[PDB]
């Protein structure tokens, strides 16, 4: 028996909306310590890593660790049947072909139960050494989403240049080119902060950054970690219960 009750059910809604356009299906590793999910996208250019720790749950029980293969489009359609203020409970058995989701309307006599069919998945898992990044930018998630949206009207790639004083985002195409410069602020979650070791300049596909920004509703800030010739990490913290990390390989 796995059973996890989340009073703030909107977190799960947001997590599926942040995954379902990048990943079709993924294996959910469920244990006593929480919910983990790792998956490359079909092109192997990006990877997502999710953790929801057992402590972030209002109730949590896991008698034995499970691996549940899930179609994320299918789970996303089922979680759209939940209100933003619903309490959401996940339940499974060890030997179940099925994940149960229960949505309790908080101030109403309405209860929804769904049984979602699981699927047989075998996943390439990667080992990602912990590392010290040359540049770590912390900024508003809304600002990062806005920058990625605007530059994809200019080109398909963005050059991210990080120095001590600020971070610059640059794109070029048939129209012309554009540069957006954010200064480090010496003055909250509208801050732009930078921990530098060396300056770094890398190029990335805006198609993938635009997928990552579907996570914006989980957090008012985002962090970008960069080193030369190594994948970008874009990280969104989830409340008190964990994170969503996205990795993206630099372009040629």
């Amino acid at each position: 028996m796995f059973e996890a009750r989340l009073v703030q059910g909107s977190i799960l809604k947001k997590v599926l909306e942040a995954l379902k356009d990048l990943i079709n299906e993924a294996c959910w590793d469920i244990s006593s310590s929480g919910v983990n999910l790792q998956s490359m996208d079909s092109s192997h250019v990006s990877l997502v890593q999710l953790t929801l720790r057992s402590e972030g749950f209002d109730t949590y029980r896991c008698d034995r660790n499970l691996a549940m293969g899930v179609n994320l489009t299918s789970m996303s359609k089922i979680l759209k049947c939940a209100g933003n203020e619903d309490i959401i409970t996940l339940r499974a058995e060890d030997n179940a072909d099925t994940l149960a989701l229960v949505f309790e309307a908080p101030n109403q006599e309405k209860v929804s139960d769904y049984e979602m069919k699981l699927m047989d998945l075998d996943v390439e898992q990667l080992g990602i050494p912990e590392q010290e990044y040359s540049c770590v930018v912390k900024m508003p998630s809304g600002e990062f989403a806005r920058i990625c949206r605007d530059l994809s009207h200019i080109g398909d790639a963005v050059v991210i240049s990080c120095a001590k004083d600020g971070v610059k985002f640059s794109a070029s195409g048939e129209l012309g080119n554009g540069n957006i410069k954010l200064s480090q602020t010496s003055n909250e979650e509208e801050a732009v902060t930078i921990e530098m070791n060396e300056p770094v300049q890398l190029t990335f596909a805006l198609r993938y950054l635009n997928f990552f920004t579907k996570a914006t509703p989980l957090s008012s800030t985002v962090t970008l970690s960069m080193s030369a010739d190594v994948p970008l990490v874009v990280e969104y913290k989830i409340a008190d219960m964990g994170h969503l990390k996205y990795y993206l390989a630099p372009k040629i």
């Binding site: 192997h44 990006s46 990877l47 898992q125 990602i128 190594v230 994948p231 390989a249």
Partner: peptide
Amino acid sequence: KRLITDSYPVVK
């Protein structure tokens, strides 16, 4: 094109 697997190899 560069892939994630070029930095972090598959491992299981």
